[PDB]
């Protein structure tokens, strides 16, 4: 492993591959974007970036944790049931992305459902995160 | 492969008479003896209302069992295992295994 | 806090029959108590031990409520 948490994985490993991936297309954009991504919304899926805060991160989780997928990988999914029926709030996940995200890894920086690196492209291209921000970073 | 002996019992001082004492017979005498330290001891906890009616202070109990699982290991006895498992007869729920 | 009459009784008897016990050290007096006694409690043996120290520390003044065989000489 190598990916995530070596550059600050929370907010300084995300925006940089995001820019690069939208600038030249790579990952899935399949219809289903509008549909509920996180439990019991009263709003739309998000204000902007419906399924473009997702894809590399959903590779990252499975990478460093070795073959967490489809039921384990929603482990680092979310759901609080933040609106509820006046009972004690409980955790959930929405399966929608699981299918698409186990498809993903066969292209771009990972190989297979057993081996999750190639040259580990994301790491190498993320070495310029530290050097210079692309967001006007506070710490750079 | 290597044969192991797990002895599962409700009570201590039944299993004790098995492991310590009657493994001496298999210690280097016919096979070699690798002692680890026995597996974690489960509790079976049950909670029972004391009162047989709806008027009390709504009291309850805590009842517990110990489950002693005593594991000691040997290095491949075959046909010798017959001796090993015929040794304890000293309490009920003494059960032994052979791989 | 306050100790029971079992404690004080046993410890008084000990200090009468033994002057092997003579110390203000908890540790020594404990090890000679426990081997000479059958009481089958940690608590009682530690109590009794500390009481025997307390006795001897008071005997440094002179007056005690304890029992000793010293009366022979006095």
């Amino acid at each position: 492993i190598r990916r995530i948490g070596k550059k600050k994985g929370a907010t300084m490993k995300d925006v940089h591959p995001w820019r690069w991936v939208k600038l030249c297309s790579q990952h899935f954009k399949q219809e289903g974007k509008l549909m509920v991504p996180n439990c019991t919304e009263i709003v739309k899926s998000s204000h902007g970036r419906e399924r473009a805060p997702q894809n590399p991160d959903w590779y990252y989780i499975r990478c460093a944790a070795i073959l967490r997928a489809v039921y384990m990988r929603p482990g680092v999914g979310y759901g609080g049931l933040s609106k509820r029926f006046s009972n004690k709030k409980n955790r959930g996940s929405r399966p929608e992305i699981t299918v698409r995200a186990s498809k993903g890894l066969l292209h771009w920086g990972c190989k297979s459902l057993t081996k999750l690196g190639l040259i580990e492209k994301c790491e190498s291209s993320g070495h310029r995160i530290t050097k210079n921000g692309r967001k006007l970073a506070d710490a750079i | 492969q290597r044969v192991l002996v797990k002895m599962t019992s409700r009570n201590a001082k039944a299993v004790e008479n098995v492991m310590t004492e009657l493994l001496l017979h298999a210690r280097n005498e016919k096979v070699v003896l690798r002692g680890p330290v026995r597996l974690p001891t489960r509790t079976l906890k049950v909670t029972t209302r004391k009162t047989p009616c709806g008027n009390g202070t709504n009291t309850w109990d805590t009842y517990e069992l110990k489950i002693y699982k005593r594991l000691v290991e040997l290095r491949a006895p075959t046909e010798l295992v017959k001796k090993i498992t015929s040794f304890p007869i000293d309490a009920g729920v003494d059960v032994a295994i052979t791989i | 806090k306050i100790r029971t009459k079992t404690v004080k009784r046993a410890s008084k008897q000990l200090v009468e029959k033994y002057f092997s016990k003579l110390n203000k050290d908890f540790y020594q007096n404990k090890r000679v108590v426990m081997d000479v006694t059958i009481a089958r409690s940690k608590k009682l043996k530690n109590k009794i031990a500390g009481y025997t120290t307390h006795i001897m520390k008071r005997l440094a003044r002179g007056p005690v409520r304890g029992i000793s065989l010293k009366l022979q000489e006095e």
Binding site: - | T57, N58, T59, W60 | -
Partner: protein, 74 residues
């Protein structure tokens, strides 16, 4: 591993300073260790203490430590 984020950070500090101390024990004289250690002890963690105050059991017929259900009149 074994508790939430906050308690892990506490545990971190402890194991770090422990490691420094033990290193300077084995490979280096007691003098250097005494210097280091005394200043650790001083500066409010303590170092030595595991802070080993854990938890409460839940009991009866009752929820946590007492606030009961809520009263019947008396």
């Amino acid at each position: 591993r074994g508790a939430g984020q906050v308690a892990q950070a506490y545990a971190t500090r402890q194991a770090i300073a422990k490691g420094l101390v033990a290193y300077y024990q084995k490979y280096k004289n007691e003098v250097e260790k005494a210097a280091l250690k005394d200043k650790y002890l001083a500066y409010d963690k303590y170092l030595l203490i595991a802070d080993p105050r854990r938890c409460e059991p839940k009991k009866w017929g009752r929820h946590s430590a007492r606030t009961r259900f809520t009263k019947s009149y008396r």
